[PDB]
């Protein structure tokens, strides 16, 4: 019926340049603005169109209809991840039995074992806290990857990065991000073949060695463990598949500890960010979660049915979560000839990507009032249409780790409310940054302490 929306050209550049930016996810969401709820993005090589209607999104998370896709980023980071949950395709042999082998350590009663570990961590980094001098503050993004890195690391595969023994930041970070920009950049590179991109290309390859070693680190570290874990690694090392009937490979078992070591800890660091600078932000709020949090938390140290009754807590995390999703894009492709909307026609393996920001801001939806900082919108959580709001991703291949990514933080948003009264000292204006996930650049804080006993 319609044809699709398009931002400018660059003959045979296509789009392709119009994301050239250290922000791209954000140019995407200016696009979507000007442009509406659907629009062709064409680079030299792929097509694929960015939804950002509930109306529309609502079919494409129909799974009859659309299996997930890897968008030009994971086909990227197979590099390193392999196939990997994240990086793999559904009907890869790996997903599968990965996903049967794997799902148990995230139920919400695994969450109950993972508790006392999770505490171990916010105990930590309360106390970097506690023992910061008044002048000091709190370089706030930096501070949360130390933890959430902490926690998939001494959860995951009973590993301590000691991350808030550092202040320099952990040799396995450093390549990481390198890796996780190289991803970044080569989408921006027309022909990301060929060099001059040789220089990166073994910039990438020396950094995939450095994550690999610290991989082979942990293998080892298990080893010389009286092994007792329930945690992840136990299970991927020694679980078999209900499904088939055999246990994972071991370079298959190497790829998943690289992605539960990534993904683990990068989109929860974000959203603590975001959480916590909303809190800063609407004083009232802040002052509604400071009540929540000491009201509930009586004990010197949560226990998990404790941080289940944090209620008001989880809105002001769904409610970051909705303003910046910190992974805020998903792709999927046509599993058959079709025409979404009864608009716009589309062909098998036709690629489309769910921009989750401007999904989390549509009018229709939502209310007028979509900028605002308003958590109470989580009440009768009913409310939400369906796939109105999906941080998570959607059906069977959506975050393994939500249960686990909330209760993190939920557990450490309530301890720090609990523990200090907090001043942005500085009037911080808010400055995405944008690995493939989003965070904070630059937010600081001080942190008056309330004295309260661990
Ligand atoms: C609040 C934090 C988190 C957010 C916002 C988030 C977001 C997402 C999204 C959007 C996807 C789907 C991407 C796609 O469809 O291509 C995903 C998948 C995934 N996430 Fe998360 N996630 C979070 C926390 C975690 C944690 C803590 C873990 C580790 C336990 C984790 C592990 C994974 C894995 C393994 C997948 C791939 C699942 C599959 O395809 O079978 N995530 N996540």
């Given at each position: 019926i319609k044809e699709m929306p398009q931002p400018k050209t660059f003959g045979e550049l296509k789009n392709l340049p119009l994301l050239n930016t250290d922000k791209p996810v954000q140019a995407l969401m200016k696009i979507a603005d000007?442009?509406?709820?659907?629009?062709?993005f064409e680079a030299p090589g792929?097509?694929?169109?960015?939804?950002?209607?509930?109306?529309?999104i609502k079919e494409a998370c129909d799974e009859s209809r659309f299996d997930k896709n890897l968008s030009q980023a994971?086909?990227?980071?197979?590099?390193?991840?392999?196939?990997?949950?994240?990086?793999?395709?559904?009907?890869?042999?790996?997903?599968?039995?990965?996903?049967?082998?794997?799902?148990?350590?995230?139920?919400?009663?695994?969450?109950?074992?993972?508790?006392?570990?999770?505490?171990?961590?916010?105990?930590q980094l309360v106390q970097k806290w506690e023992r910061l001098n008044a002048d000091e503050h709190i370089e706030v993004?930096?501070?949360?990857?130390?933890?959430?890195?902490?926690?998939?690391?001494?959860?995951?595969?009973?590993?301590?990065?000691?991350?808030?023994?550092?202040?320099?930041?952990?040799?396995?970070?450093?390549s990481m991000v390198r890796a996780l920009d190289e991803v970044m950049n080569k989408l921006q590179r027309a022909n990301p073949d060929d060099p001059a991109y040789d220089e990166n290309k073994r910039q990438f390859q020396e950094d995939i060695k450095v994550m690999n070693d610290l991989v082979d680190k942990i293998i080892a570290d298990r080893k010389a463990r009286g092994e007792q874990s329930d945690d992840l690694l136990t299970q991927m090392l020694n679980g078999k598949d209900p499904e088939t009937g055999e246990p994972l490979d071991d370079g298959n078992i190497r790829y998943q500890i690289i992605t539960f070591l990534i993904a683990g800890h990068e989109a929860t660091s974000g959203l603590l960010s975001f959480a916590l600078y909303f809190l800063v932000k609407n004083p009232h709020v802040l002052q509604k979660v400071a009540e929540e949090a000491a009201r509930v938390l009586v004990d010197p140290v949560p226990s998990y049915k404790q941080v289940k009754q944090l209620k008001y807590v989880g809105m002001v995390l769904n409610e970051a979560l909705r303003?910046?999703?910190?992974?805020?894009?998903?792709?999927?492709?046509?599993?058959?000839?079709?025409?979404?909307?009864?608009?716009?026609?589309?062909?098998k393996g036709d690629e489309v990507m769910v921009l989750i920001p401007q999904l989390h801001r549509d009018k229709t939806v939502w209310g007028?009032?979509?900028?605002?900082?308003?958590?109470?919108?989580?009440?009768?959580?009913?409310?939400?249409?369906?796939?109105?709001?999906?941080?998570?991703?959607?059906?069977q291949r959506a975050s393994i780790g939500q249960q686990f990514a909330l209760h993190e933080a939920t557990l450490?948003?309530?301890?720090?409310?609990?523990?200090?009264?907090?001043?942005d000292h500085t009037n911080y204006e808010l400055d995405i940054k944008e690995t493939l996930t989003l965070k904070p650049k630059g937010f600081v804080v001080?942190?008056?302490?309330?004295?309260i006993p661990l």
């Open positions: 000007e442009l509406g709820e659907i629009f062709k792929r097509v694929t169109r960015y939804l950002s209607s509930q109306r529309l994971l086909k990227f980071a197979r590099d390193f991840a392999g196939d990997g949950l994240v990086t793999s395709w559904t009907h890869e042999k790996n997903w599968k039995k990965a996903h049967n082998i794997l799902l148990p350590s995230f139920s919400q009663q695994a969450m109950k074992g993972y508790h006392a570990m999770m505490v171990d961590i916010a105990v993004s930096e501070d949360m990857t130390r933890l959430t890195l902490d926690t998939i690391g001494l959860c995951g595969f009973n590993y301590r990065f000691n991350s808030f023994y550092r202040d320099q930041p952990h040799p396995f970070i450093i303003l910046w999703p910190t992974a805020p894009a998903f792709s999927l492709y046509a599993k058959e000839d079709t025409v979404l909307g009864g608009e716009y026609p589309l062909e007028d009032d979509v900028e605002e900082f308003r958590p109470e919108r989580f009440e009768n959580p009913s409310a939400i249409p369906q796939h109105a709001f999906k941080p998570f991703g959607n059906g450490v948003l309530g301890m720090m409310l609990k523990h200090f009264d907090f001043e001080k942190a008056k302490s309330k004295k």
